[PDB]
Amino acid sequence: GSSGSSGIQVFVKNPDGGSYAYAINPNSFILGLKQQIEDQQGLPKKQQQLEFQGQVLQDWLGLGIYGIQDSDTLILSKKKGSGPSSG
């Protein structure tokens, strides 16, 4: 387990059947959190899409801009599709 007086703990529910508690500052940018999921899970950000209360969290929108709090849940869904251009 982990802990930290500073920062909020969010649960990332994967489309598989589980959830992982991630650590990220509330002032940080959304993208920041995603990265951690791309380096931990290996899944590409462009794919990983977290939605809250039915809203797409941008990258330039801090975790606060929306109003996210600690002990919150985040749904993960891979972009259903694939382009012929892979870089």
> What distance lies between CA 68 and its chain's CA centroid?
12
What domains, with CATH codes, occur in the chain?
Answer: 8-78 (3.10.20.90)
CA distances from 64 to 20, 31, 39, 49, 79 (A): 21, 13, 23, 18, 25
**Method of structure determination:** NMR
Burial 32-41 (b: 16+ CB within 10 A, else e): ebbeebbeee
Distance CA 72, CA 52 (A): 10
Handedness of CA 18, 15, 52, 64 (dihedral sign): positive
